[PDB]
Design a protein around this ligand. Structure first.
Ligand SMILES: COc1ccccc1[C@H](NS(=O)(=O)c1ccc2[nH]c(=O)ccc2c1)C(=O)N(CC(=O)O)Cc1cccs1
Lengths: 14, 697
């Protein structure tokens, strides 16, 4: 059984 | 001016979303040239480096971001995802819990934490954390879809209809927006998605492999155009993470050694280290060549090794499963690359030429479900090693506790020898079944079962309690060795009734949907006293199934659950059932082979997906077309007839018991010969200068 994918967070520069 | 670095970083973020990973890397690095202490740019760069498979370099930039900004929760959560991929679960948990401690409202980190719980087998905590993520970020496709699979796993069908609607909606939106779908390819079979969507899901996950090989800047390989360098022999390479104690070896471990060395040279490329089991020993000893690619983690260097061996046909046994390195196939080290056996579906990927299947599983009218060209085996593409692994189940005897074939069962290598010294055994004609009367020996055997004793000795023969195999010989329990003793298997061991029909299904519960359980309920309601035998797979799904069954008019005492068992006990106890009811949503695959080897008729309704038609392919090769239903009414009628016409049940059980031996289904030698004829059609086709086309003979 494959590992569950994850969500990378993109950071907005301000 | 600070807008310079900020603008580069935010433009790179856009490029990443668009799939232009190379340009994103360039802009992130330019941002770091302009503003070296740029925490966000370090972390965003590490994100795309992770996506390119540069895991160690990504970690380094994550730590730089956190050194610059110790409370940068994005970087902690992103780093957790990289550690999870490196198999460092404790490191990943430490990062996720740090991120959530910094920012309790951080939806993404809650969802990434949930994925750890899901993979650990802690489905209630995964559900809680996914639900926290969706509460914080209501539009969150990864969390919704992985939550949906959590609920599938435990058979929680609350608002199942709206769940499927939204799953399909999410995939449509993601496909339309050129994003990676949040439904995984191996799961797409479970949901009412179109065949186009399932193929597109596959292609997009395959594209992930391209981002990881493109950074290698490798040119195309030159491929052999003849067999001269190999002495006229076709070089076949089997690539798999599962040469070991894994169901794929339980299916095909005999095939490498059965290839004809006068016309074939067999290379097995292991993606996993040696797990110490006899499965790994056997393939390493019987393949002409065995190559441990787990020692060569660079996919460019591993592909070079494949290409140096001169492989003509390279066989992908993983598809989208744990342990896959489809990057190897994306680099195309061989002129012909085929999907086979390990993955029930299309790769959707340009870099795979063929899928090895058959006309029952994959009839020509549905070729559009697959990106590959179809390559037909003559009977079924499925195969199992049961005849080699479980020969003790070729014969059985029973005790007449009063005559049934599946209430008290004995199997063993020396079973016939044992019975030679019991002069009062009766031989029943049904291929012959000996029947031990209720004598002194039988009482001692039954007493062993009732007292939970491990084994007894009668006339020098060891007689084992079938529930204690791991205490007697752990290698017998796993299928690594053939059991030596006579084994006793009984309905009482599993709480099954002695005087009623047992319908069984030994699949994971996520293969059941409401529609399937309703169909099973219709059957039980028509066969009085019959029961359904399912597995705690997992246990927390049991109250959900019991509750839904009761709402369908079925008392709780009609469904009996047993624990998951070691491999040999799981196949052996299939002999206690009268009938197996196959799951139409996704059939039993390995488990279909298992139940037929026990002689248990399996009723199935082939669907449209490859995964929904395997069991019928198996039953066609077996030669029991009367067990294959054209619709739900036929499926119920067949199952009810087997449970109510006991002479018919004896007839059909007799067919399975006999044809598991006489048909091609479990014949690995014939399978390997026909596999070889298919490889040679592929090779000749290529050798004549043609691109792949269907090989349907
Ligand atoms: C070594 O087994 C691997 C390895 C990798 C992936 C799947 C399996 C394995 N598939 S298998 O064909 O062998 C197999 C075995 C026992 C079985 N016992 C049953 O009662 C019913 C089915 C069954 C199937 C598996 O499905 N398991 C269940 C899980 O994931 O928790 C793990 C195991 C549990 C007991 C021994 S093994």
């Amino acid at each position: 059984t494959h590992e569950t994918g994850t969500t990378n967070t993109a950071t907005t520069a301000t | 001016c600070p807008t310079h670095a900020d603008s580069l970083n935010n433009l790179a973020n856009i490029k990443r979303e668009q799939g232009n990973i190379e340009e994103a890397v360039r802009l992130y690095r330019k941002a770091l040239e302009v503003f070296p202490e740029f925490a966000a740019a370090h972390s965003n760069l590490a994100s795309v480096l992770q996506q390119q498979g540069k895991l160690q370099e990504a970690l380094m930039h994550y730590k730089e971001a956190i050194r610059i900004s110790p409370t940068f929760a994005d970087a902690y959560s992103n780093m957790g995802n990289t550690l999870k991929e490196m198999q460092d679960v404790q490191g990943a948990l430490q990062c996720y819990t740090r991120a959530i401690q910094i920012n309790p409202a951080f939806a993404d980190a809650h969802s990434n934490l949930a994925s750890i719980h899901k993979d650990s087998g802690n489905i209630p905590e995964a559900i809680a954390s996914y639900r926290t993520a969706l509460k914080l970020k209501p539009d969150f496709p990864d969390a919704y879809c992985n939550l949906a699979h959590c609920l599938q796993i435990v058979c929680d069908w609350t608002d199942y209809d709206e769940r499927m609607k939204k799953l399909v909606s999410i995939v449509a939106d993601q496909l339309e927006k050129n994003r990676l779908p949040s439904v995984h390819p191996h799961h797409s079979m479970l949901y009412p998605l179109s065949h186009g969507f399932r193929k597109a899901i596959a292609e997009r996950h395959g594209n992930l492999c391209l981002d990881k090989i493109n950074v290698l800047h490798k040119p195309p390989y030159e491929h052999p155009k003849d067999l001269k360098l190999s002495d006229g022999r076709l070089r076949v390479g089997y690539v798999s993470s599962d040469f070991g104690n894994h169901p794929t070896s339980h299916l095909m471990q005999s095939i490498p050694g059965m290839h004809n060395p006068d016309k074939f040279e067999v290379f097995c490329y292991a993606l996993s280290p040696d797990d110490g089991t006899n499965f790994r020993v056997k393939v390493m000893a019987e393949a002409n060549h065995f190559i441990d690619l787990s020692q060569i983690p660079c996919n460019g260097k591993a592909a070079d090794r494949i290409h140096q061996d001169g492989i003509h046909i390279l066989v992908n046994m993983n598809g989208y499963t744990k342990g896959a390195r489809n990057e190897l196939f994306a680099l195309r080290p061989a002129p012909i690359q085929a999907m086979w056996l390990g993955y029930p579906g299309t790769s959707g990927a340009l870099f795979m030429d063929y899928i090895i299947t058959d006309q029952e599983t994959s009839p020509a009218e549905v070729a559009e479900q697959y990106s590959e060209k179809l390559a037909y085996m003559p009977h079924t593409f499925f195969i199992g090693d049961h005849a080699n692994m479980f020969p003790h189940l070729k014969k059985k005897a029973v005790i007449d506790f009063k005559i049934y074939d599946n209430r008290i069962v004995l199997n063993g290598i020396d079973l016939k020898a044992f019975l030679d010294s019991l002069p009062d055994v009766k031989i029943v004609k049904m291929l012959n079944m000996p029947v031990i009367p209720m004598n002194t020996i039988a009482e001692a055997v039954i007493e062993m079962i009732n007292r939970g004793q491990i084994q007894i000795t009668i006339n020098g023969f060891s007689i084992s309690n079938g529930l204690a195999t791991t205490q007697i010989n752990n290698k017998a329990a796993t299928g690594e060795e053939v059991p030596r003793t006579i084994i006793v298997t009984t309905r009482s061991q599993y709480g099954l009734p002695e005087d009623a029909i047992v319908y069984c299904n030994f699949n994971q519960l996520y293969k059941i949907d409401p529609s399937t359980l309703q169909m099973w309920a219709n059957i039980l309601k028509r066969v009085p006293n019959s029961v359904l035998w399912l597995l705690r797979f997992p246990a927390v799904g049991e109250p959900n199934i019991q509750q839904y069954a009761q709402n369908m008019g079925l008392p709780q005492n009609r469904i009996i659950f047993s624990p998951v068992a070691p491999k040999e006990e799981h196949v052996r106890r299939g002999q206690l059932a009268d009938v197996c009811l196959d799951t139409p949503l996704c059939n039993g695959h390995t488990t279909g082979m298992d139940v037929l080897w026990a002689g248990t008729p399996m009723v199935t309704m082939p669907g449209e997906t490859l995964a929904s038609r395997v069991a019928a392919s198996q039953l066609t090769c077996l030669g029991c077309l009367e067990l294959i239903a054209k619709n739900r009414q036929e499926y119920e009628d067949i199952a009810v007839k087997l449970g109510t016409d006991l002479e018919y049940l004896k007839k059909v059980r007799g067919k399975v018991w006999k044809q598991r031996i006489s048909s091609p289904l479990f014949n690995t030698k014939q399978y390997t010969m026909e596999l070889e004829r298919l490889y040679l059609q592929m090779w000749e086709h290529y050798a004549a200068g043609n691109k792949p086309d269907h090989m349907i003979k």
